[PDB]
Amino acid sequence: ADKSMMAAVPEWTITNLKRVCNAGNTSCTWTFGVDTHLATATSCTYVVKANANASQASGGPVTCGPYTITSSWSGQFGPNNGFTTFAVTDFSKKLIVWPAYTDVQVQAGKVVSPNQSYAPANLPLEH
Amino acid sequence: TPADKSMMAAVPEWTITNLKRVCNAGNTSCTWTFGVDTHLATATSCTYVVKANANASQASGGPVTCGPYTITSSWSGQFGPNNGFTTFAVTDFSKKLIVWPAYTDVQVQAGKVVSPNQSYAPANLPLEHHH
DSSP: OEEEOBOSSOOEEEEEEEEEEOTTSSEEEEEEEEEOSSSOOEEEEEEEEOSSOGGGSOEEEEEETTEEEEEEEEOTTOGGGOEEEEEEEETTTTEEEOOEEEHHHHTTSOOOSSEEEEOOEEOOOOO | OOSEEEOBOSSOOEEEEEEEEEEOTTSSEEEEEEEEEOSSSOOEEEEEEEEOSSOGGGSOEEEEEETTEEEEEEEEOTTOGGGOEEEEEEEETTTTEEEOOEEEHHHHTTSOOOSSEEEEOOEEOOOOTTO
């Protein structure tokens, strides 16, 4: 038997996503909004620090409004295809999305356009 | 350029089949076994081993290749240990598609197959095959 874990709600849009890292790459500040389209959007500032290579570091958990956010960077496909995945969880709703951005997309410190939308999945936590 | 873009690919959901975690007695190795069934093709069977000096069940794994897939995993206790959960990242590099199956420790701790099989909608990952 098969069960779809995808929620029957609109995709969540990650708005105006950008990554700004300091000169030494020991701190990267990600800013974005989370717009579920069914409620007021949430604005987030998400800072990842490291002794070296903050852009490769795993971040969080960070709270932003109803969300708990982490991130993980992967160079599994080589540096040219490095990418960061966020895990954005609304614990109250038991919903999770995983926005994922290549370094190519965010390296210039400009906002990613278009905004990217993701379908939430159910996470069967026990409250 | 449009304002917004759905990243969800126009393909059937990938079903993770017969998922099981078995860790050794000292929790220095956990073997996850599961299939990736995209339905568009016959399923791929995978054996995914995560090793650690301690607490392999909490350790990040991969990358491991299984058929066309590259797989990593990360465990999170952000909601407390009773709500620990493992998230996989399963990417088909050639198709530029990725899913993130996620299982709570409660679901897998018995070492028994998770049922029902859980399916996930793939997202597009805009990797550059042409640098």
